[PDB]
Amino acid sequence: VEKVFFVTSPIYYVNAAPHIGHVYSTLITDVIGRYHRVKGERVFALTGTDEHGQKVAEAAKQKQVSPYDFTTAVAGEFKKCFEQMDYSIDYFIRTTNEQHKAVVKELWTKLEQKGDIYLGRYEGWYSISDESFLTPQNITDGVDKDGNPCKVSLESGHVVTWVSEENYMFRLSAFRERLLEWYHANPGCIVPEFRRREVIRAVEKGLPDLSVSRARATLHNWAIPVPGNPDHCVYVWLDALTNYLTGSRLRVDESGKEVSLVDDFNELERFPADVHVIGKDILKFHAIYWPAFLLSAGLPLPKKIVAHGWWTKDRKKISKSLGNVFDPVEKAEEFGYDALKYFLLRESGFSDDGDYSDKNMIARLNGELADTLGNLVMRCTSAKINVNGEWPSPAAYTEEDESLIQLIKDLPGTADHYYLIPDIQKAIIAVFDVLRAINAYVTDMAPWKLVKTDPERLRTVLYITLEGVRVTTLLLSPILPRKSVVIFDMLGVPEVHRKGIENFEFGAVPPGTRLGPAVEGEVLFSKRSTE
Numbered sequence: 001v002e003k004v005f006f007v008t009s010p011i012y013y014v015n016a017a018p019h020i021g022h023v024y025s026t027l028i029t030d031v032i033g034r035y036h037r038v039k040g041e042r043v044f045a046l047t048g049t050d051e052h053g054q055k056v057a058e059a060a061k062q063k064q065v066s067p068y069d070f071t072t073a074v075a076g077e078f079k080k081c082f083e084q085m086d087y088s089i090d091y092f093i094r095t096t097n098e099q100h101k102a103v104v105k106e107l108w109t110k111l112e113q114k115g116d117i118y119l120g121r122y123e124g125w126y127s128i129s130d131e132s133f134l135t136p137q138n139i140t141d142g143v144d145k146d147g148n149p150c151k152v153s154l155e156s157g158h159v160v161t162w163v164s165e166e167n168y169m170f171r172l173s174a175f176r177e178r179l180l181e182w183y184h185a186n187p188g189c190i191v192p193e194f195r196r197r198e199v200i201r202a203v204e205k206g207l208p209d210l211s212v213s214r215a216r217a218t219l220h221n222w223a224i225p226v227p228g229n230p231d232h233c234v235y236v237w238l239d240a241l242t243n244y245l246t247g248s249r250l251r252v253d254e255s256g257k258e259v260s261l262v263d264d265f266n267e268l269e270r271f272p273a274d275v276h277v278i279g280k281d282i283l284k285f286h287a288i289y290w291p292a293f294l295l296s297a298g299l300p301l302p303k304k305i306v307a308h309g310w311w312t313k314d315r316k317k318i319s320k321s322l323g324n325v326f327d328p329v330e331k332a333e334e335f336g337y338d339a340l341k342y343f344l345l346r347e348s349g350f351s352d353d354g355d356y357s358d359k360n361m362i363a364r365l366n367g368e369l370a371d372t373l374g375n376l377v378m379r380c381t382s383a384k385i386n387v388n389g390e391w392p393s394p395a396a397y398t399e400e401d402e403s404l405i406q407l408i409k410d411l412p413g414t415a416d417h418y419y420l421i422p423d424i425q426k427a428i429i430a431v432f433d434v435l436r437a438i439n440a441y442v443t444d445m446a447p448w449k450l451v452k453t454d455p456e457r458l459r460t461v462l463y464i465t466l467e468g469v470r471v472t473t474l475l476l477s478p479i480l481p482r483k484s485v486v487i488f489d490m491l492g493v494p495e496v497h498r499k500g501i502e503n504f505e506f507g508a509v510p511p512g513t514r515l516g517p518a519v520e521g522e523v524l525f526s527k528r529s530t531e
């Protein structure tokens, strides 16, 4: 089926300034979208801010300013950050948006008409910081920021409070068997596999009904009113998850502003998400509640949920109060935007909790970007080796020649599979496995020597090198968007050959193509010292 490839990030609470976790999640969303655009697909990538709720309302109250002013300011910080990070997200959604508000009321009414919302009570634990209902098995003893004994979440370590409230309840218990059929019938729907097994195990054990409203006082009236009952507000998470539906129904102008909300999602051909990128901390909301709501409402389910891990810096937790900051904009100015992105996507896989150190960052920048990629690009574009600044016409291929060609022809299929899991780390490793192979080839053939000794042989070696670099670069263009453009300019690849599955083929750029001009000082990635 041909639709718009729809990929999303979580919408982030605006209780505090943006940081690495938000940047990382949105990066993964951005990269997936970028890859599908280079395949020549229609793409709609979505990110944004989650602006209602007790968490955020109380964050605003502690800064002594109104929730409207606070959310608008912090949302502004998120937008600025994401612009500075040079992403290619199609739309930034805010849950305070009036059109989203309308979609939530629609979904609610659908759930009610379906017979799946009833008036009950929740009596149990709740984490305001996570906006999460917790069973007693998921809480333990801890200390509040007074240092007094309290209860905390086993999930997150945040303070938990006991809630006892007449609330509208969603019939999640009724959806156990249908969710289990869904997980088994679609064994690639949750990635990575151990998180899928986690979800199945949790749902096997049984599901309780879920509170989808709260008394209005508790939310400091900072929430969407329940249709037909203005004493209740819609659960922040039902509101929040609905952002994906809203996004699928907004017509956006070229400026990035929303202009119109269509009645039926089929009009825009986005819904359901092909990939929801999330962090492991919000798996239940996306893999259990969300599909339950969609099943109730009669809407189609997402194709994949991919859940990544958390970051540490110098093997310590990230927090400004502890004395260990990791600012992405700061590190990107220092080391480079594409390089920082490369590092975040290369150092850790979605199954892992990654670790940034300036040491390891410099190791990769120098080792892989500079010595593997950059070195190769400069050799095959050098006036020394490539005396005519053109793509030569290859002569006969030796067997060693063809072993390398095979690797280059095989690469796109392999990278494609990894990008589709999605497992960006393995995609990158795959591409650099091929770059390392081209380097060893170039060392072996010593093309600097061939300029004088065997110019016909040099033609062959230089051509293979140019083409392996082109193909590897194309496949890395979602990871290194700005640098890929430089590389292609240096190689003189025409614009048309910088996109499309046609150009995944070995040989798409014809011999005789002229390289772009050299600069006196230029290097792609500059090595950095190890202080």
Ligand code: MET
Binding pocket: 009, 010, 011, 012, 013, 050, 240, 241, 242, 243, 282
């Ligand atoms: C529908 S995704 C909501 C995510 C939530 N706002 C968070 O920051 O964890």
